């Protein structure tokens, strides 16, 4: 109820017109500020109590950002495009020691997004579903977050079948990339904690805050 994909698309269009690891971390911190502005544009998100807004963003920021730079890289050959305007090529990541996770992003996310031609509206809805994660611990009202998630995938399904009537299994295909996004998001976080532990690789203030407890 009251979750038009038009508003979701606007949010997407509104927030985005030597060591690759350092560049990636720098791009993440930068995008964390934009993520907040993006979320505020997601219908009903700002109507939730501040505490729940913090919990949802802290719980999904990594998956939310991975989804964004992955879709942005659909045109890129073998690499990803950072929000900073730089490109991280597959070989560069490998030469930096993060080849394993990098290839998972290309194979499980980027490549798949390109093969099915995932559009910005679909991207937005998937990110909105992730944002409204009812399983996030500490939620004062998980039921309300649950209702909002259902409204999103309900509007997403409507969008599909209508925009792509020829592809009846598109809606399910979109949601079935979430498990891979969940797995890749966890691995990327593991690397970040290790980078912070080792000391190398500069980590900015907002990214650092996201690594804080819990």
């Amino acid at each position: 109820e009251d979750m038009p994909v038009e508003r979701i698309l606007e949010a997407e269009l509104a927030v985005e017109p030597n060591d690759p690891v350092t560049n990636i971390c720098q791009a993440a911190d930068k995008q964390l500020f934009t993520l907040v502005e993006w979320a505020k544009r997601i219908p009903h998100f700002s109507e939730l109590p501040l505490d729940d807004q913090v919990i949802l963003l802290r719980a999904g920021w990594n998956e939310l950002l991975i989804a964004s730079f992955s879709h942005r890289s659909i045109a890129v050959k073998d690499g990803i495009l950072l929000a900073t305007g730089l490109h991280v090529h597959r070989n560069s990541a490998h030469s930096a020691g993060v080849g394993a996770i990098f290839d998972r992003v290309l194979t499980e996310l980027v490549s798949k997004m390109r093969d099915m031609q995932m559009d910005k509206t679909e991207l937005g809805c998937l990110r909105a579903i992730v944002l409204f994660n009812p399983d996030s611990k500490g939620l004062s009202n998980p039921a309300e977050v649950e209702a909002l998630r259902e409204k999103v995938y309900a509007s997403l399904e409507a969008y599909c079948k209508h925009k792509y009537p020829e592809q009846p299994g598109r809606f399910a295909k979109l949601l079935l990339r979430l498990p891979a996004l969940r797995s890749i998001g966890l691995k990327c976080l593991e690397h970040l904690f290790f980078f912070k532990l080792i000391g190398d690789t500069p980590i900015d203030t907002f990214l650092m805050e996201m690594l804080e407890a819990p």
Binding site: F33, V36, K40, L50, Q53, V54, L57, R58, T205, F206, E209, M210, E212
Partner: peptide, 11 residues
Amino acid sequence: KHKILHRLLQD
């Protein structure tokens, strides 16, 4: 706790 995030969401 979560100083930056709270401030940004509030404005």
